[PDB]
Amino acid sequence: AGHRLVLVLGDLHIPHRCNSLPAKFKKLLVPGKIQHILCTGNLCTKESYDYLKTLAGDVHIVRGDFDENLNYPEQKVVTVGQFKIGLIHGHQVIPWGDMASLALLQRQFDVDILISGHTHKFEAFEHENKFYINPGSATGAYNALETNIIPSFVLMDIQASTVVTYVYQLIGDDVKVERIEYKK
């Protein structure tokens, strides 16, 4: 209806570390449903960019540290509905995934939601009025810290003052979905 569906994913590392998204993620990612894609980077080649384009017309990608495409911006600020959203791959946040370092970027970008990746660990939490999302790695690709990476991605359902974030994780060989709500 009046909802805006945003797919948030990244750190695919195709084809160096993985060949494809999990079979059970691809069944759920069908064309014609998602309005926008925000990708944290590390695709890492044009084949995965083309795959995202089959899912939505509006694909937004920031530059990861293993991306072949050096034209992607380092970071991006977009507005969807009433929400300003920041996007960055996250290898620039020191130390990795530190919320103090993430918070300074939030203030620097003046965004309601900050999306980052690079850790391959899904996290979504609200902190001092602001919302922070890491979709993890959609392929479960190994990391330079690894320890059992779980494939995952995020869907944001944006309607009026609320964001409903859905987390899809591959745990065992079953897709577990969790739902977290954020209000501006």
Binding site: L155, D157, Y168
Partner: peptide, 4 residues
């Protein structure tokens, strides 16, 4: 539901 979920959208997928």
């Amino acid at each position: 539901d979920d959208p997928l």
